Amino acid sequence: DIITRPTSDSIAAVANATKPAAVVSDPQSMKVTPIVNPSSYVCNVCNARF
Amino acid sequence: FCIPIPQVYPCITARRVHYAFTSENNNDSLFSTNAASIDTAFGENAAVS
């Protein structure tokens, strides 16, 4: 069995105040495509693709 | 082939990923760069030969 005593209002306010965005969009981002192509999947034994 | 466009001011360039590049100097067809400007700051600073 579990319970959850909610945190005090004060500390919650402080914590929510400081929350930078984890995913920001900027034009200079050092883009790198996937190493393996995610589109096609090849049967490693009979080379049949899907 | 992919080539950066020469710029006329010191800019901030993003790190890029390149794969292809030849083995000799096959660049003779290039005539000039930034002809209308006063100087090429970052890119290939080609001038009239």
Instruction: Nearest chain A residue to B13 by CA: give it.
Output: A28
Q: Are B4 and B36 in contact (CB under 8 A)?
A: no
Read off the DSSP letter of residue A19. Answer: -
Distance CA B35, CA B46 (A): 9
What method did the depositors use to determine the structure?
cryo-EM
Distance CA B9, CA B7 (A): 6
CA A39 to chain CA centroid, nearest Å: 20
Closest Cα partner for B32 from B12, B13, B16, B47? B47
B14 chain-A contacts, CB cut-off 8 A:
27-30
